[PDB]
């Protein structure tokens, strides 16, 4: 049975109203209704993985474990294997698995971040899981961001609370944060992201939405906008909307948005928004394509409808040759030529790197760097010819080829990440000089750059 080099990943989020779901949810798992949907020759394909998160989910897990299950036997004639679930609140995250995947998935993690303070903590957060798919890291977030439409800043903060607290992946990454650990990552939620025009819009809006004319409408959706503006999910990518707003219905129809100002509101308007959102990050040169992304038409339990997004995803299998794991291939070598530095800091200490990659037996710190002042105000922090050569584990191209490495810049005087970034080592050519580049990040935030030239020998 060979290993696979491709799976396939389903991606549901459902804002559940705090009511139980209606008898049939099967159209969600199947990406059928608007938008990007699939094809009806592929219904009895099951996915590989199906990641479920829920927000005001009034389910026990063992309820909605149940309901799950019988939903994907009913479509697939498959029994799905739970990966794991965890629940904050009624914010929830499932991972079901197909049977014959239950021996490549490990390394199983959880978490939750709790966002807010005193008034602003007691609902709001999210929860993770990650995991191991033979070579391949997965992480997966859900959350329920703040609500309101004057509260995008506090959504794009508990967005940077989630992924600095959220502990997922490999601990011994200690500089990066989960937008660095993972092969591929997915976060989606009810991010409570607003369409921003005026309240007296709300019929306009109505109109448009009735016309499946969405262009006028997304050009003000917060999400996109903080986006473009760089102050929210830097890095990450979201599939074109082509689905209605997700939110806010009248229960029990699709028919009605219910947008007015009410008690049970805190006397805010609800105009129509696509609060319920999949995006992704995954590092460079990997194989990662949205087959869908969408809305049900079918399931009115909610005043939000469920989204669903599929993914292919390119994986690796778990590499054995007769050197490494347990040793280096002297076969094998990594190295850096003219590399800098461009920290936004304001601050002059001296930096140093570290590699990590799980192509190396473990970490590797360089020698500092030489500061000079750039053109333009910049420290620049100069390595030249001065990284160390990086002794992979395996030397098989096959192998070496679809590594990657993370870098961190520190400072010398406080061991502290100024800026994290990762390094595709699918190159054009091998034992040849080769440009690379990263942006560097700390806490989500672009904080710098990392360029120079990489020569890589495989056994090859
Ligand atoms: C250079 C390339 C990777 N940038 C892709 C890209 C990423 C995000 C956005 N927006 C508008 C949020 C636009 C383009």
Redesign the pocket.
């Given at each position: 049975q060979p290993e696979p080099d491709m799976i396939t990943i389903f991606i549901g989020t459902w804002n559940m109203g705090n009511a139980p779901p209606p008898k049939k949810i099967t159209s969600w798992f199947l990406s059928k209704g608007q938008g990007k949907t699939r094809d009806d020759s592929a219904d009895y394909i099951p996915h590989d993985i199906y990641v479920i998160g829920t927000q005001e989910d009034p389910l026990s897990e063992k309820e909605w474990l149940e309901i799950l299950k019988h939903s994907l036997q009913e479509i697939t004639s498959v029994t799905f294997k739970t990966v794991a679930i965890h629940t904050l609140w009624n914010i929830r995250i499932v991972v079901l698995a197909k049977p014959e995947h239950e021996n490549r998935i490990s390394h199983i993690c959880t978490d939750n971040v709790k966002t807010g303070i005193a008034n602003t903590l007691g609902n709001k957060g999210a929860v993770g899981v990650s995991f191991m798919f033979n070579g391949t890291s997965l992480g997966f977030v859900n959350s329920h961001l703040t609500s309101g439409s004057e509260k995008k800043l506090r959504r794009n903060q508990n967005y940077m609370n989630i992924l600095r607290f959220l502990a997922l992946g490999d601990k011994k990454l200690s500089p990066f944060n989960i937008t660095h650990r993972f092969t591929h990552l997915f976060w989606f939620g009810d991010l409570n992201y607003r369409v921003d025009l005026p309240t007296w819009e709300a019929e306009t809006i109505i109109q448009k939405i009735k016309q499946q004319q969405y262009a006028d409408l997304l050009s003000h959706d917060q999400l996109?906008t903080e986006?473009?503006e760089q102050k929210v999910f830097l890095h990450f990518?979201e599939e074109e909307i082509t689905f209605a707003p997700t939110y806010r219905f009248e229960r029990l129809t699709r028919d009605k948005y219910a947008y007015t100002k009410q008690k049970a509101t805190g006397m805010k308007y609800n105009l129509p928004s696509w609060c319920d959102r999949v995006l992704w990050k995954s590092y460079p040169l990997v194989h990662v394509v949205c087959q869908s992304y969408g809305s049900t038409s079918d399931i009115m339990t909610s005043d939000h409808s469920p989204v669903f997004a599929t993914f292919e995803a390119g994986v690796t299998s778990q590499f054995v040759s007769k050197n490494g794991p347990g040793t280096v291939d002297s076969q094998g070598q990594i190295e850096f030529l003219r590399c800098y530095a461009t920290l936004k800091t304001k601050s002059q200490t001296k930096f140093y790197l570290e590699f990590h990659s799980s192509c190396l037996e473990s970490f590797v710190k360089s020698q500092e760097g030489e500061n000079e002042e750039g053109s333009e105000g910049e420290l620049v922090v100069k390595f030249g010819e001065t990284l160390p050569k990086l002794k992979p584990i395996i030397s098989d191209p096959e192998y070496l080829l679809d590594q990657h490495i993370l870098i961190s810049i520190k400072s010398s005087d406080s061991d502290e990440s100024y800026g994290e970034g990762c390094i595709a080592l699918r190159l054009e050519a091998t034992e040849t000089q080769l440009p690379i580049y990263t942006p560097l990040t700390h806490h989500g935030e672009l904080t710098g750059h990392f360029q120079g030239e990489i020569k890589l020998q495989t056994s090859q």
């Open positions: 996109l986006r473009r990518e």
